Amino acid sequence: SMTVCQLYAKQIRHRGNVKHNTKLGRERLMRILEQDRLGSCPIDSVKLSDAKEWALRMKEKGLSYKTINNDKRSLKAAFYTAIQDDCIRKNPFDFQLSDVLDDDTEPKVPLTPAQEESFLSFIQGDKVYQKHYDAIVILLGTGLKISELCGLTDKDLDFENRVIIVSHQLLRNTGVGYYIDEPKTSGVRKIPMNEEVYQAFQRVIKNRKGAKPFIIDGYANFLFLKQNGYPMTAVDYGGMFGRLVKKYNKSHEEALPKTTTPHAMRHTFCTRLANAGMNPKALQYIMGHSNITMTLNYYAHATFDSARAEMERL
Amino acid sequence: SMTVCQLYAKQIRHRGNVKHNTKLGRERLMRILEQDRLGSCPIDSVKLSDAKEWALRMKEKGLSYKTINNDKRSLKAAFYTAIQDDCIRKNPFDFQLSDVLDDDTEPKVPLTPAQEESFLSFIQGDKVYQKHYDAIVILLGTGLKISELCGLTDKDLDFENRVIIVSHQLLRNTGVGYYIDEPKTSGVRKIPMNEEVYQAFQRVIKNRKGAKPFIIDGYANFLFLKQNGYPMTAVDYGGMFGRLVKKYNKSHEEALPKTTTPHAMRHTFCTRLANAGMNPKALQYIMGHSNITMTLNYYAHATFDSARAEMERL
DNA sequence: GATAACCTAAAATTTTCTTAAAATTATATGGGATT
DNA sequence: AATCCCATATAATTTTAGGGAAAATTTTAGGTTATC
Q: Answer whether A296 sits within 8 Å of B296, measured CB to CB.
A: yes
Angle at the Cα of A151 (from A164 to A106), degrees rounded to 5? Answer: 95
Task: Enumerate the residues of chain B whose CB falls inside 8 A of the CB of residue A192.
Answer: 304, 307-308, 311-312
Query: Cβ–Cβ of A310/B282 closer than 8 Å?
Result: yes
Question: Which of strand D's nucleotides are less than 7 A from any protein C-beta?
Answer: 4-29, 36
Per DSSP, B97 falls in state G
> A residues 45-104 near B, CB within 8 Å?
86, 89
Distances (CA, A) of B30 to A85, A161, A235, B10: 32, 61, 60, 11
Do residues B28 and B71 lie in contact, with contact meaning Cβ atoms separated by under 8 Å? no
Q: Cα separation of B260 and B247, whole Å?
A: 12
Three-state SS at B42: strand
Q: Coil, strand, or helix at residue B219?
A: strand
Alpha helix locations (H) across chain B? 4-14, 20-35, 48-61, 65-84, 113-125, 133-142, 146-150, 195-206, 234-251, 262-275, 280-287, 292-296, 304-312
Q: How far is B285 from chain A (nearest CA, A)?
A: 7
- Please report, rounded to whole angstroms, the spatial distance between the CA atom of protein residue B241 and the C1' atom of nucleotide D30: 20
State how beta strands A163-166 and A169-173 pair: unpaired
| B285/A276 CB distance under 8 A | no
A97: nearest Cα among A120, A128, A127, A74:
A74
Taking CB atoms and an 8 Å limit, are A311 and B192 in contact across chains? yes
Quote the minimal CA–CA distance from A291 to chain B in Å. Answer: 9
Q: Which of A157, A135, A137 is nearest to A147 (CA)?
A: A135
Evaluate whether A223 touches A205 at the Cβ level (below 8 Å): yes
DSSP annotation string for B137-200: HHHHHH---HHHHHT-BGGGEETTTTEEEE--EEEEETTTEEEEE-------EEEEPPHHHHHH
Q: Identify the closest residue of chain B to A89 by CA–CA distance.
A: B84
User: Are residues B306 and A277, on separate chains, in Cβ contact within 8 Å?
Assistant: no
Q: Which residues of chain A does B314 touch, with a Cβ-Cβ cutoff of 8 Å?
A: 273, 276-278
> Is residue B225 classed as helix, strand or coil in its secondary structure?
strand
| B31 CA from C29 C1′ (Å) | 73
What does the alpha-carbon distance between residue B231 and residue B211 come to, in Å, rounded to a whole number? 8
A-proximal residues of B, 205-224, CB under 8 Å = none
**Inter-chain Cβ pairs, chain A and chain B, closer than 8 A:** 97
Task: Mark yes or no for CB contact A310/B277 under 8 Å.
Answer: no
Chain A contacts of B286, Cβ < 8 Å?
A: 307, 311
What region, left, alpha or beta, does residue B60 occupy, with left being phi > 0 and alpha being psi -120 to 50 degrees?
alpha
Q: Which residues contact A32 (CB under 8 A, 6 or more apart)?
A: A58, A71
The DSSP line for chain A is: --BHHHHHHHHHHHT----HHHHHHHHHHHHHHHHSGGGGSBGGG--HHHHHHHHHHHHHHT--HHHHHHHHHHHHHHHHHHHHTTS-SS-TT-S-GGGTS---PPP-----HHHHHHHHHHHHH-TTTGGGHHHHHHHHHH---HHHHHT-BGGGEETTTTEEEE--EEEEETTTEEEEE-------EEEE--HHHHHHHHHHHHT---PPS-EETTEE-BS-B-TTSSB--HHHHHHHHHHHHHHHHHH-SSPPPS--SHHHHHHHHHHHHHHTT--HHHHHHHHT-SSHHHHHTTSPPP-HHHHHHHHHH-
| Resolved by | X-ray
CA dihedral B8, B11, B12, B17 (to 10 degrees): -170
Contact status of B303 with chain A (Cβ, < 8 Å): yes
